[PDB]
Amino acid sequence: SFSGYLKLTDNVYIKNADIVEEAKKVKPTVVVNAANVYLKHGGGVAGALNKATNNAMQVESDDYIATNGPLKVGGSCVLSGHNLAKHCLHVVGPNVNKGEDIQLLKSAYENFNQHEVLLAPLLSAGIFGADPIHSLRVCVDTVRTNVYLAVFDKNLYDKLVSSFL
Ligand SMILES: CNCc1cnn(-c2ccccc2)c1
């Protein structure tokens, strides 16, 4: 199972790790992708996860969008985890850089409650432009299922742990 995580709460764990490497090692039931509404996995966590699947994640995602249309900001869909996990839960956090409502971050994290255990990044962090300290706070106050957070950046990981209330 998951190893080397620091326990933050009864159900939230955190590790300084590359979520792609973490997923390839653990092969969790669910890996969360930091998706956009179009499932266009160009960069950040999404680009990295998609590149690890040899673009199979993007091919599957394009078929999903062709059939269903875009997701909502704050919404999600379950697709294959390919070589990374049994499933990938594509979750759309608000992208502050595109002027999206930060209040939708709680709705985005609520998607995690449909899965007993997940490997995930901090939603809306990184290239999505939100404050990762705020994202972790919303995560701990919203997710009730077991969430293993992978934080790529060591300096950000240290700041998140050291400032965690
Ligand atoms: C083998 N490394 C793949 C890779 C590239 N980028 N990231 C990454 C970036 C931001 C957030 C999480 C992960 C992982």
From Swiss-Prot:
Inhibition and activation profile: Inhibited in vitro by GRL-0617.
How does the record say this protein sits in the membrane? Multi-pass membrane protein
Q: Where is the Macro domain?
A: 1-165
Q: Which reaction does it catalyse?
A: Thiol-dependent hydrolysis of ester, thioester, amide, peptide and isopeptide bonds formed by the C-terminal Gly of ubiquitin (a 76-residue protein attached to proteins as an intracellular targeting signal)
What quaternary structure, including any partners, is listed in this protein's UniProt entry? May form homohexamers. Interacts with N protein.
- Protein purpose: Responsible for the cleavages located at the N-terminus of the replicase polyprotein. Participates together with nsp4 in the assembly of virally-induced cytoplasmic double-membrane vesicles necessary for viral replication. Antagonizes innate immune induction of type I interferon by blocking the phosphorylation, dimerization and subsequent nuclear translocation of host IRF3. Also prevents host NF-kappa-B signaling. In addition, PL-PRO possesses a deubiquitinating/deISGylating activity and processes both 'Lys-48'- and 'Lys-63'-linked polyubiquitin chains from cellular substrates.
Query: What's the protein called, per UniProt?
Result: Papain-like protease nsp3
Q: Which gene encodes it?
A: rep
* Full-sequence range covered: 1027 to 1191 of 7096
